[PDB]
């Protein structure tokens, strides 16, 4: 019989209710055998059950009915196209009657790292151990066991895996029945999983050691490989405090007895939020309190908070389809940075969030941008949806939605949202619906969010204060080469009477509006702490009004405010809406700034212009530029110390200012670094380097054939991977072109550097002048082997191309890049990343056309 179902999506007909999954995995032969009991129910009438299965050889497929424990055969129907199978059920099953479906099969554990995958490694004591695991998001679950692989099909799961002795079997639900067998082949059984989606099932097998402590009735525990079990003491201490936070904030308890964060011992692992079985990359969980830095700590906190908050948003409440993927990931990313601002207020993670949002708007403002709520009908369109825009734009709205409504009003809308839809499937509108339950009254709708969800980019708010009235105008943020309108939650701040800290909130929802100022005011800053996902372009007089204010007392606003202004003006000066001289006229206050967040972002914008110029041929112009910026920050830079002393926020600024003054060579900043490196290099690297200066010091030393050759030694040897990654950066900061090419050519086939490091190398080599042309040449001249080693549409093959072309700014280069991709295929030439790259270079030219002549008549 030919396949009775011809659509992508599974028919609404049959529905799973209870899953039983029994497996026997052979880790040393990369194969296994498994059995699946699928308690299905009927809703409509059909002669076939349609579900998902890929890459299997199936023993028997048996059928059954209610209260008659006999089972009759029923042939199978594979199509492998959509990854669908069909049971040609003999008795036309009917609405209301549950049926049990059993399938036993054999298949391969995966050689790659997607689906049910295994891998090998070596021990502390050089003993070749083994390991296996799962990554099922978003469509991999069907590769393991035949099932209903769509997210809106929640059900229960009984998992059992027949492992070996010294191994540890783990899965979503806790162990309960372990029953040794007669060959030393222990078998475990895990509890019936609560109602959850297929993609969220997990089970792993490998030699591990626990570290636990149960709080409020829930066993939190960081499982991992034997040796590293000592470095997981920050992981656990944090997971408790954060689980304690989320349970309290959501007013729902974590509906499990245990919570397992396993640090998979592989560099190509998949971090994932499986219920009860959280997965991490080993590197990204180990935090040594002694040797590790702030960037090491911030990451480990941030990545746990994201995985935890996912238990609520994404596990409990799961979206109905991948078009609303942003609902989980946008929320997980919001609760991520939000939990930290409440519990880990030391980290100053709001800074990270701000810069993150910065870099999101720059990408959302492009033409390649796709709205977060976007029709998804294929499977590559699904992979696509796991992009920056979903995580951070989505996050930005919830923040904008948060700071608009009361903080308390945001929580209530969540608590109720979480309550109403628990263990069910969600839609974008359904979040909005339980978001308008109150105040108390439906004083406002969330049709307001329907412009932010359905169309790409963000508004450009234009502002003209002409006395006591403030004229607002909105428009699409476009980059020269209708539709739109937004429901914008406007906020503003000014000083009025006795420095009256006046702030207010509005909602422009038409092409034009006006805000009524209480008094007369000398300056007015719109969009406070960039809570709103948009850019504000003031009029000439009001720009210059804020600049004057900044030069007098720039602390009447927050650090976020000040950072936001620097961002917006440079990005406006880019598109031509403002002369670049005014952008620099704004930062002139920076001589009197002690807050990192404005300084980092200001150092970013100017470093970009320096690098863009440099790669053309304007070395003089570029060098005169960084000195202008240096003189502003001269005091701060001198005043810095080469230690690890201060708040996270302050140690960040230290790393920023130092890495800066050393890169272009400014003041004593070098030599000091060169001194330290000589000391460190002398002691065979037994001297502790202050991880805040570690990268700078490493880089400076790497400019000598000796110091460089040393740092290569300390890479092929030592184990500190965060240190190893700071060393590699230095290696690829060498000006000796030969050394740079040797790095790229080596890293490719993985001789002294893993091929995962290749992207990082090509990028770093290509940011600085000597490597610049050499990086892009490496990409072209080895493109075929690049496409072999990386899926032609994974984050790596994009990161490489963007990383090696985003600095070209000439018509001539534009044609060269375009032509190279043309001469491949059009199926590569029309690929999201490559078309986007061309847009960047096009925009780079536009920037030069608009500002280069302007820039020259300074000095």
């Amino acid at each position: 019989k030919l396949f009775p179902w011809a659509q992508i999506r599974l028919p609404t007909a049959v529905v799973p209710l209870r899953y039983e999954l029994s497996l026997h995995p052979n880790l040393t032969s990369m194969t296994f055998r498994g059995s699946v009991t699928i308690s299905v129910q009927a809703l409509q009438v059909t002669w076939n059950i349609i579900l998902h299965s890929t890459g299997h050889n199936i023993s028997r497929v048996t059928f059954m009915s209610a209260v008659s424990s006999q089972e009759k055969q029923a042939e199978i129907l594979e199509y492998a196209y959509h990854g669908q199978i069909a049971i040609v059920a003999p008795e036309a099953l009917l609405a209301g009657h549950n049926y049990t479906l059993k399938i036993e099969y054999s298949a391969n554990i995966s050689s790659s790292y997607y689906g049910f995958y295994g891998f090998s490694y070596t021990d502390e004591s050089n003993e070749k151990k083994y390991f296996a695991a799962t990554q099922f998001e978003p469509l991999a679950a069907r590769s393991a066991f035949p099932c209903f692989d769509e997210p809106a099909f929640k059900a229960t799961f009984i998992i059992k895996i027949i492992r070996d002795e010294q191994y540890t079997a783990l899965s979503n639900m806790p162990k309960k029945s372990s029953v040794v067998l007669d060959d030393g082949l222990v078998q475990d059984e895990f509890s019936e999983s609560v109602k959850m989606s297929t993609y969220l099932v997990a089970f792993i097998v490998g030699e591990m050691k626990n570290l636990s402590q149960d709080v409020n009735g829930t066993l939190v525990s960081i499982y991992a490989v034997p040796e590293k079990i000592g470095q997981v003491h920050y992981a656990l201490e944090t997971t408790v405090k954060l689980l304690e936070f989320f349970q309290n904030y959501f007013e729902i308890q974590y509906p499990l007895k245990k919570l397992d964060l396993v640090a998979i011992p592989d560099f190509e692992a998949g971090a994932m939020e499986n219920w009860g079985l959280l997965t991490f990359r080993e590197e990204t969980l180990l935090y040594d309190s002694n040797t590790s830095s702030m960037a090491d700590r911030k990451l480990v906190t941030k990545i746990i908070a994201h995985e935890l908050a996912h238990q609520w948003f994404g596990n409990l409440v799961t979206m109905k389809w991948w078009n609303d993927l942003w609902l989980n990931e946008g929320f997980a990313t919001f609760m991520e940075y939000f939990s930290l601002e409440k519990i880990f207020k030391e980290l100053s993670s709001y800074e990270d969030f701000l810069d993150a949002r910065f870099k999101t708007m720059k990408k959302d403002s492009l033409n390649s941008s796709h709205p977060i709520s976007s029709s998804v009908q294929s499977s590559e369109q699904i992979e696509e949806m796991f992009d920056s825009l979903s995580y951070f734009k989505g996050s930005s709205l919830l923040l904008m939605l948060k700071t608009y409504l009361s903080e308390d009003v945001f929580q209530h809308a969540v608590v109720l949202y979480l309550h109403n839809h628990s263990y069910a499937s969600i839609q974008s509108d359904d979040l909005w619906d339980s978001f308008n339950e109150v105040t108390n009254q439906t004083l406002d709708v969330k049709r307001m969010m329907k412009t932010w969800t359905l169309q790409k980019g963000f508004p450009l708010v234009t502002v003209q204060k002409k006395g006591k009235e403030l004229f607002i105008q909105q428009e699409r943020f476009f980059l020269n080469m209708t539709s739109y309108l937004w429901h914008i939650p406007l906020s503003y701040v000014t000083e009025g009477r006795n420095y009256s800290k006046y702030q207010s909130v509005s909602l422009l929802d038409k092409k034009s509006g006006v805000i009524n100022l209480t008094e007369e005011v000398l300056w007015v800053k719109v969009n406070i702490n960039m809570n709103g996902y948009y850019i504000v372009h003031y009029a000439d007089d009001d720009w210059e009004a804020l600049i004057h204010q900044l030069k007098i007392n720039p602390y009447v606003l927050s650090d976020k405010d000040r950072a936001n202004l620097i961002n917006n003006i440079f990005e406006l000066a880019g598109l031509g809406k403002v002369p670049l001289k005014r952008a620099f006229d704004l930062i002139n206050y920076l001589g009197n700034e002690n807050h990192t967040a404005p300084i980092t972002e200001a150092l970013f914008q100017t470093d970009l212009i320096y690098n863009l110029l440099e790669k053309l041929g304007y070395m003089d112009l570029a060098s005169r530029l960084v000195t202008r910026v240096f003189k502003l920050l001269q005091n701060q830079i001198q005043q810095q110390t080469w230690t690890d002393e201060g708040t996270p926020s302050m140690r960040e600024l230290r790393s920023a200012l130092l890495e800066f003054a050393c890169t272009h060579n400014l003041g004593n900043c070098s030599t000091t670094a060169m001194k330290l490196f000589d000391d460190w290099m002398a002691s065979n690297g037994t001297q502790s380097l202050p991880t805040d200066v570690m990268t700078t010091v490493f880089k400076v030393g790497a400019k000598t054939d000796k110091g460089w050759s040393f740092l290569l030694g300390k890479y092929i040897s030592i184990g500190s991977e965060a240190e190893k990654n700071k060393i590699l950066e230095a290696l690829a900061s060498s000006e000796d072109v030969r050394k740079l090419y040797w790095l790229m050519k080596s890293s490719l086939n993985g001789d002294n550097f893993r091929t995962q490091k290749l992207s990082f190398i090509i990028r770093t080599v290509g940011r600085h002048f000597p490597g610049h042309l050499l990086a892009w040449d490496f990409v072209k001249e080895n493109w075929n082997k690049l496409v072999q080693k990386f899926p032609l549409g994974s984050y790596t093959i994009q990161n490489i191309v963007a990383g090696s072309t985003y600095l070209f700014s000439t018509k001539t280069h534009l044609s060269e890049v375009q032509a190279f991709f043309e001469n491949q295929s059009e199926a590569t030439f029309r690929l999201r990343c490559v078309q986007e790259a061309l847009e960047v270079i096009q925009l780079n030219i536009q920037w030069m056309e608009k500002n280069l002549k302007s820039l020259t008549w300074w000095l």
């Binding site: 990204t284 993150a356 796991f386």
Partner: peptide, 9 residues
């Protein structure tokens, strides 16, 4: 999840 470098993109 989606961490490596960048954040941003």
């Amino acid at each position: 999840x989606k961490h490596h470098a960048f954040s941003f993109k």
